């Protein structure tokens, strides 16, 4: 509808796949080469389905901060025959608050879904499903099951992936440039 949705669509159309684990279908953001991210509660194993094709997992790393606190981001390297467009230059370098973000989801349940979520707070600590979690972004939208893995963008920036909600608010794990240096 406007330039926020423009940037979100440009990321969805080239940098997402549908990931299926034994815990469900997730929006999965591809970052560069064969490297993608997904919520850690997806419980990635040795094999994953990528757009319904059986795919070997070459590496999976559940990130934690240097306090040994959950970040709810798993970095996955896929045995895929095709690279993702490199989008690492759209990742923030530091923790921050944002205005006027969009949450974008693409699954079998919710194809081509875009939600203007508005202002994003650097929330910090969250007890997420009973797990102490850091680097949480919060937005005041009543987000639902089906949305986990959804991408949170502003114009020019890819800032997080949706990891939960409480019925009134939604919560994303931050993406930082420093997670994807090689």
Alpha-carbon torsion angle 126, 144, 8, 128, nearest 10:
10
Catalytic residue from among 25, 134, 148, 162: 148
**Taking the CA atoms of the chain, what radius of gyration do you get in angstroms?**
15
Token pair, residue 153, equals 């963008």
- 176: three-class secondary structure by DSSP: coil
CA distance 170 to 117: 9
Cite the beta strand spans of 86-182 per DSSP E: 98-105, 113-128, 131-139, 151-154, 157-165, 170-174
Number of domains in the chain: 2
Token pair, residue 34, equals 């064969």
The residue with tokens 């997080």 is: 160
Token pair, residue 65, equals 């901060």
- Asked if 165 and 147 sit in the same domain, the reply is yes
The residue with tokens 């990528």 is: 50
Number of H helices, E strands in the chain: 1, 12
CA distance 123 to 138: 6
- CB–CB of 28/17 below 8 Å? yes
Print burial letters for 88-111: b (CB count within 10 Å at least 16), e (below 16): eebbbeeeeebeebbbbbbbeebe
Token pair, residue 114, equals 């875009």
Q: Which helix (H) or strand (E) holds 19?
A: strand 16-21
**Final residue of a domain: which of 84, 101, 133?**
84
- CB–CB of 173/72 below 8 Å? yes
Q: Give residue 33's domain range.
A: 16-84
CA distance 99 to 80: 35
Token pair, residue 166, equals 């409480």
Active site residue 54: no
CA distance 132 to 134: 7
Catalytic residue from among 25, 72, 106, 134: 72
- Asked if 131 and 43 sit in the same domain, the reply is no
- CB–CB of 25/107 below 8 Å? yes
DSSP state of 83: P
- Asked if 172 and 95 sit in the same domain, the reply is yes
Catalytic residue from among 41, 106, 134, 162: 41
The residue with tokens 């440009």 is: 10
**Final residue of a domain: which of 67, 84, 101?**
84
* Elucidation technique: X-ray
Active site residue 94: no
The residue with tokens 């606190």 is: 69
Active site residue 106: no
- Asked if 20 and 97 sit in the same domain, the reply is no
- Asked if 109 and 94 sit in the same domain, the reply is yes
CA distance 138 to 171: 5
- CB–CB of 102/112 below 8 Å? no
Residues 6+ away with beta carbon under 8 Å from 182: 32, 33
CA distance 31 to 23: 22
- Asked if 75 and 58 sit in the same domain, the reply is yes
């Amino acid at each position: 509808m406007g330039p926020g949705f423009d940037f979100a669509q440009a990321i969805m159309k080239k940098n997402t796949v549908i990931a299926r684990t034994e815990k469900g279908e997730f929006t999965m953001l591809g970052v560069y080469d064969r490297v993608a991210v997904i919520p850690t509660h997806a419980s990635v194993g040795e094999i994953i389905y990528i757009n319904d094709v059986e795919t070997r997992v070459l590496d999976a790393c559940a990130l934690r901060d240097l306090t040994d606190t959950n970040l709810e981001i798993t970095i996955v390297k896929l045995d895929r025959n095709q690279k993702f467009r490199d989008i690492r230059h759209f990742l923030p370098r530091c923790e921050d608050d944002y205005n006027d973000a969009v949450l974008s989801v693409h699954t079998s349940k919710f194809p081509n879904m875009y939600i203007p979520v508005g202002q994003v707070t650097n929330y910090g600590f969250l007890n997420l499903g009973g797990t102490p979690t850091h680097r949480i972004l919060m937005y005041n939208f009543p987000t639902r099951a089906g949305q986990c893995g959804g991408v949170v963008t502003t114009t020019g920036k890819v800032i997080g992936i949706h990891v939960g909600g409480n019925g009134a608010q939604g919560f994303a794990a931050m993406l930082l440039h420093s997670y994807f240096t090689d």
